[PDB]
């Protein structure tokens, strides 16, 4: 029943989340930080199932 009547999901796109994170981190753009580089390997294509 849940599968048949949940045809979509209202997720915000990942690009806006990346941009919001970039503005909040105090580290320099050139300096490498793992938290920033880790979320870049994500996609929202399995959001409906979850």
């Amino acid at each position: 029943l849940d599968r048949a009547f949940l045809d979509g999901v209202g997720f915000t796109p990942l690009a806006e989340k990346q941009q919001q994170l970039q503005l909040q981190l105090k580290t320099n753009i050139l300096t490498a930080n793992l938290i920033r580089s880790a979320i870049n390997g994500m996609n929202t294509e399995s959001n409906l199932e979850v």
Binding site: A15, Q19, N43, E45, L48, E49
Partner: protein, 1320 residues
């Protein structure tokens, strides 16, 4: 003293540096350059004379030469200073027309002279058309040809000659093989006609043959003479007329008189004119594009340079004898009037229909014999006899001898005495990523235990029957000689120069070029040889296997691209089936300069399309309302042609919505299948993702399975696989449908509009069978059909083919195991012969089967088990349409055969068979000098790589460099000489290696500084065509597309580049504005080449060109280099190549991983592929290359650093792209797709060992802008000295130059950051 001699090979540089001592590397390179300069001089010395003779024959005999070096440029000239920089800005109305004094003399020769080297020939014909059967009305070349032929052989009815077939003999030979379709009376569906009659012919005359239009033209004929295909009873023509009479008398009273039944009984309908039928059949069947017109090749290779050819091989006199007698005996009918009406050459037949192909074959015979350096008797003989057999019938004879040639290629090595086995390391068949390394040789007398030892007589009789059938119609070529000599082919051995023979034999098989077969006849018989008779259990097994195999692949975490991205990916695909260009009107108001025959003229003529137009304007409708369901609609059908004359291949194009919807549904299946990098994954089974460009890396398993004795290979091949599925399509498509219902979280909701549908919804609508109908054009009418099956242009044909191929293989192996177990319990194969691992690899239709053993079964065991398997597959996996033949595939042991690449005893036997000189679907005769020089160098490189002597092939190629590369510039003719090949990066004295950079640095003193600038001015000025952007003016439409495509921005839309110089051209908002022009260069690039043809002449007319390049300004080099002798052993898996190349390969070993080796053509493409899901919408190799070309090294970084991409990888691929731009020039063919350096990619010089060669540096890590440059220079240096015979094992960076290089970034990063510091 003539260089054109076999005694003088361009290979006199290998034994040079082998033994003696070498010093600082500055003077041996100068010595090589000086020697090549001398060679080029003696080459041009006779090239000019050959050009003079050719022009004297082609035109009025008086011709005189005059050296026109820079000192002469002071002489009378013309200067339109205003119209100087010729360019295009923005049935014709003529502009201002001012006269010019015709600076050049009408009929003379002007050869250049730059630094003591004649390199450019210039002349012009001032449009001397006076007022604008009949043998006199022939071209002067044809008149000379006829006069010489008549002088040679007048009359006497010279025997063993050409006897063109006539109509009344063609009829006696093929009267039982022609039938009339008779639309309503064939009683077989999926064919419908709207011409009231049509001709079906199979076997008898399926390909047109050499017949004359005048013997028995038989203006009108009654078709009843032949037979009715569908019914024997309804054939009488009298009843076929009395029925008409009775029905007409009934109709007088008043009757329904069904048109189908009535008009059939009219004897009138069976009327046709043979001449029109034959002409139409010829004008869709044989294609003639090539690269040069044959009238130049005919006299140039047979009446001026003939002494060169005969002096080496005397057996070739027979071909000229045959050609001259053929011209003398009949005369006039021989015709080659070419019609360059718009841009396409179309031959026009008159005396004979296949007269052209006859000449094609006669020239390709001598071409093949000369280039392949056969060093054995009776083999070039048997080649000559096969050639004289294909002489008489150029197309039908090709198919007649195809059987004999392929069965000859089948065994070809069974009766041997030595083989020189090649030994490799153990290869793990299980891991697909496994690579092979060579280890040594061993001599062995054991013959390969292939098949056909059981069926030796069955094939010997078959080939002998084919040969006697060819001979009986031929001119009695002493069949005893043929039967005695054909048995010589399998008494060879894999030592010495016998490996070249297998490669050479296939080249002769494609002597005639690109013929096709009738489409209707093929579509008739291919749908008849299919049998269903079988059990429903097998169908259930197939369904369940397919459904299970789809389910395991669809479920994954791979992302699915959105519709706006997938639309622009479709345009990039440019499928020949998919393309449907449509433009309401693209007015070519381009002001084009005109020939200065008397006065300069400016004219504008409109032209439309000429390139794939995606109809992105109509995307508005495609994205929104568009239903993807099929209901008996009609679409147009296109056909392709193949070499070898095997048959006609049909492509079934699909509408845009279907292709778009399909790509989304299978994106997740296609990606995993084409993983490229996969390790022991379930995907392993599929090999769809391979380079395929080179054999060692692409198909490692086949070579190993061919040398190892503990495994066998099963390379069975099937009949027409796509047609064979027409009886199981309803089940496999159903399995495809319900395999996408599960493992998908979304549920069906029933929508019919694109973008308003779930991923699951697409499946219900798309995979619903019911195929469309296809309309193509044939002779005497156009026919439509309905094909149930995998189809062709379907967005999943390869996936479906590999799913079906891997399914029945399991069911065949299942029962083969039972049969083998049965044989084991009785006394035959014996116990202890049990396989452990079996691997099946599928690439579309073709597939292979490899089984490994612990104890290797003896020779007859292999035959028994192979026969058992082939019998098991033919009843278990062939009862539902498929058909396997043991005699069709290289089944057996010690040798495996993948797609056109096969390996025996560790020796690769590539098939080459590439013919640029006679290509099909091309306009090389109207191509630019750049495209010609790019194609002239790479196809020949492949030919030498796949087995050909480097010396003779390039000698023959050099015999036409002036005759080719003749650009037309409105009464301005050029004739380039051998020097031009230096600019693209080829050294004659060197090997087939891209020695471009090394030449260019030394291309300062020894000339060679001119040709590179010439090719640059021929190509690079097309950047003005790029700078000619077309604004939106006449139409707007829904224009919702710009809203449709968008990427997140950082510097708004009014920033990221204050000046439009690097802002407006790459605007996020202007995405589609940019790609509209960046998808249409060609339609006006073809005429931009035409206008650039003026500028290139004006460069040599004026003081332009001759300037030094910019590459040599920067100082790069090494210090303290250590150099030692090469290994000097010859065991290489590529036995067809030259001795020196084999010596290089063993020293360093086989190349691996095809990525660490730079090859900037594919490195950045691989980086781009691995970079998905962060890339913006519009991105590809073309965009990056054009952006770098336009914006230098500043604007590229400026624009992309504000487009939301991280800096490190953008910098890395920027280094890759500058390396690409410095490796060679532009070339539309080179940048698009791309072309490898072959020899340079099959030798391990990757960064793995290249890092070890460079001595470790103490200072800071060097930037990537120069590391990829100096290491590329080191790679080129490594490839050259080795050809000479020495190797470098140590190298210092010369850090006094490295500091200047580290200083660059110091002030460069500063420029990048400082412009940020100000908000300009």
């Amino acid at each position: 003293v003539s260089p054109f001699l076999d005694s003088t090979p361009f290979t006199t540089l290998h034994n040079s540096l082998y033994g003696q001592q070498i010093h600082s590397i500055d003077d041996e390179l100068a010595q090589i350059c000086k020697l090549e300069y001398e060679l080029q001089t003696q080459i041009a010395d006779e090239q000019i004379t050959a050009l003079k003779h050719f022009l004297t024959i082609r035109t009025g005999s008086p011709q005189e030469i005059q050296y026109v070096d820079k000192e002469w440029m002071k002489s009378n000239q013309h200067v339109p200073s205003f119209l100087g920089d010729v360019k295009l800005m923005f049935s014709y109305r003529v502009q201002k027309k001012h006269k010019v004094q015709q600076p050049l003399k009408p009929n003379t020769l002007y050869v250049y002279k730059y630094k003591g080297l004649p390199r450019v020939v210039l002349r012009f014909v001032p449009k001397v058309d006076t007022t604008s059967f009949s043998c006199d009305d022939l071209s002067p070349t044809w008149k000379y040809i006829l006069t010489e032929a008549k002088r040679a052989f007048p009359d006497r009815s010279y025997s063993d000659c050409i006897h063109p077939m006539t109509w009344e003999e063609w009829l006696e030979e093929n009267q039982d093989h022609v039938k009339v379709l008779t639309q309503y009376a064939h009683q077989l569906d999926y064919v419908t006609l709207l011409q009231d009659f049509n001709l079906y012919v199979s076997g008898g005359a399926s390909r047109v043959r050499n017949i004359d239009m005048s013997t028995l033209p038989t203006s009108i004929n009654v078709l009843d003479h032949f037979e009715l295909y569908g019914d024997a009873s309804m054939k009488e023509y009298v009843r076929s007329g009395e029925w008409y009479g009775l029905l007409r008398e009934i109709e007088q009273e008043g009757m329904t008189v069904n048109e189908s039944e009535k008009v059939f009984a009219n004897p009138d309908t069976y009327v046709l004119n043979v001449k029109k039928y034959f002409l139409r059949r010829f004008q869709q069947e044989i294609a003639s594009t090539g690269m040069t017109p044959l009238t130049d090749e005919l006299l140039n290779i047979m009446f001026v340079h003939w002494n060169i050819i005969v002096t080496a091989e005397p057996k070739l006199q027979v071909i000229k004898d045959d050609l001259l007698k053929y011209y003398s005996r009949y005369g006039v009918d021989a015709t080659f009037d070419y019609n360059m009406k718009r841009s396409e050459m179309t031959v026009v037949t008159r005396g004979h229909l296949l007269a052209h192909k006859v000449l094609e074959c006669a020239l390709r015979i001598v071409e093949t014999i000369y280039t392949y350096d056969i060093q054995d008797e009776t083999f070039k003989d048997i080649l000559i006899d096969l050639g004289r057999l294909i002489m008489r019938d150029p197309i039908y004879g090709t198919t007649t001898v195809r059987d004999a040639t392929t069965v000859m290629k089948q065994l070809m090595y069974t009766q041997g005495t030595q083989f020189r086995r090649i030994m490799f390391k153990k290869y793990d068949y299980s891991n697909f990523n496994e690579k092979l390394v060579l280890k040594g040789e061993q001599m062995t007398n054991e013959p390969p235990t292939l098949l056909a030892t059981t069926h030796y007589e069955e094939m010997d009789k078959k080939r002998i029957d084919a040969l006697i059938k060819a001979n009986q119609r031929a001119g009695n070529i002493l069949s005893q000689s043929s039967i005695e000599r054909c048995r010589y082919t399998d008494s060879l051995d894999l030592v010495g120069d016998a490996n070249r023979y297998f490669s050479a034999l296939t080249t002769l098989e494609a002597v005639a070029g690109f013929a096709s077969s009738d489409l209707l006849s093929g579509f008739i018989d291919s749908n008849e040889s299919i049998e269903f008779t079988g059990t429903a259990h097998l169908r259930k097994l197939l369904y369940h296997s397919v459904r299970e195999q789809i389910t395991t692949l669809n479920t994954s975490t791979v992302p699915r691209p959105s519709l706006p991205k997938v639309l622009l990916s479709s345009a990039k695909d440019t499928a020949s089936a998919s393309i449907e260009p449509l433009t309401f009107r693209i007015y070519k108001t381009t002001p084009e300069y005109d020939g200065e025959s008397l006065n300069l003229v400016e004219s504008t003529v409109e032209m439309s399309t000429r390139q794939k137009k995606p109809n992105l304007m109509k995307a508005a409708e495609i994205l929104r309302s568009t239903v993807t369901t099929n209901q008996e609609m009609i679409i147009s059908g296109g056909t392709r042609a193949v070499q070898g004359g095997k048959g006609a291949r049909a492509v079934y194009p699909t509408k845009q919505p279907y292709h778009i919807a399909g790509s989304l549904l299978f994106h997740k299946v296609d990606t995993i299948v084409n993983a490229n990098k996969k390790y022991r994954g379930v995907s392993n089974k599929y090999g769809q993702g391979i380079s395929n460009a080179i054999p060692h890396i692409g198909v490692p398993e086949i070579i190993a399975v061919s040398s190892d004795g503990m495994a066998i290979c099963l390379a069975l091949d099937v009949s027409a696989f796509d047609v064979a599925q027409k009886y199981t399509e309803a089940d496999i498509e159903l399995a495809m449908r319900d395999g996408f219902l599960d493992s998908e979280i979304s549920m069906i909701s029933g929508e019919t509009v694109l973008e308003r549908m779930n991923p699951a919804d697409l499946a219900n609508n798309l995979l619903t069978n019911t195929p469309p109908r296809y309309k193509y054009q044939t002779a005497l009418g156009d026919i439509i059909i309905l094909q149930h099956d995998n189809r062709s242009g379907v967005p999943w044909t390869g996936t479906q083919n590999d799913l079906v191929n891997v399914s029945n293989h399991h069911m065949a192996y299942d029962e083969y195991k039972k049969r083998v177990a049965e044989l084991q319990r009785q006394g035959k194969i014996s116990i202890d012969v049990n396989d452990k691992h079996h691997i099946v690899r599928v690439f579309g239709d073709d597939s292979t089967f490899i089984m490994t053993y612990d104890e290797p079964p003896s020779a007859e065991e292999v035959h028994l088990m192979c026969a058992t398997f082939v019998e098991s597959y033919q009843d278990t996996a062939g009862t539902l349409g498929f058909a396997i033949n043991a005699r069709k595939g290289m089944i057996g042991r010690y040798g495996s055969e993948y797609l056109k690449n096969s390996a025996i005893y560790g020796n690769i036997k590539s098939v080459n068979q590439v013919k640029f000189r006679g290509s099909e679907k091309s306009a090389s005769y109207h191509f630019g000098v750049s495209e010609k020089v790019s194609m002239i160098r790479d196809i020949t490189d492949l030919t030498i790589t796949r087995g050909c002597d480097e010396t003779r092939k390039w000698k023959y190629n050099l015999m036409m460099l002036p005759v080719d590369l003749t650009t037309r510039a409105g009464a301005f003719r050029m004739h380039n000489l051998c020097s031009i090949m230096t600019g693209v990066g080829k050294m004659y004295l060197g090997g087939t290696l891209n020695n471009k950079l090394i030449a260019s640095y030394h291309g300062s003193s020894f000339g060679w500084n001119f040709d590179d600038n010439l090719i640059k001015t021929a190509n690079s000025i097309g950047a003005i065509s790029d700078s000619s952007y077309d604004a939106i003016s006449t139409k707007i439409t829904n224009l919702a597309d710009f809203k449709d495509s968008q990427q997140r921005i950082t510097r708004d839309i009014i920033t990221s580049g204050r000046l439009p110089q690097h802002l407006n051209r790459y605007g996020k908002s202007n995405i589609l504005r940019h790609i509209l022009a960046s998808a249409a260069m060609g339609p006006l690039s073809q005429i931009e080449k035409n206008v650039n043809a003026y500028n290139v002449v004006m460069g040599i007319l004026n003081g332009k060109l001759e300037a030094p390049t910019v590459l040599e300004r920067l100082n790069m080099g090494f210090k303290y280099v250590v150099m030692s002798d090469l290994k000097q052993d010859d065991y290489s898996p590529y036995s067809c190549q030259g001795l020196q190349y084999r010596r290089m390969l063993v020293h360093w070993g086989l190349n691996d991983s095809r990525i660490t080796s730079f090859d900037p053509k594919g490195k950045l493409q691989h980086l781009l592929a691995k970079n998905s899901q962060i890339l913006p919408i519009h991105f590809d190799i073309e965009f990056v290359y054009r952006l770098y070309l336009q914006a230098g090294t500043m604007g590229f970084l400026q624009v992309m650093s504000y487009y939301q991409l991280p800096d490190t990888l953008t910098h890395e691929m920027l280094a890759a792209v500058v390396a690409l731009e410095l490796q060679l020039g532009n070339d539309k063919y080179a940048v698009d797709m791309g072309v490898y350096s072959s020899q340079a990619g099959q030798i391990r010089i990757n960064d793995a060992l290249m890092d070890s060669i460079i001595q470790h540096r103490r200072g800071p890590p060097l930037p990537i802008i120069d590391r990829t440059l100096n290491r590329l220079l080191l790679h080129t240096y490594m490839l050259m000295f080795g050809l000479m015979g020495k190797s470098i094992d140590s190298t210092k960076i010369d850090p006094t130059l490295s500091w200047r290089a580290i200083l660059e970034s110091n002030d460069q990063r500063i420029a990048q950051l400082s412009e940020l510091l100000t908000a300009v």
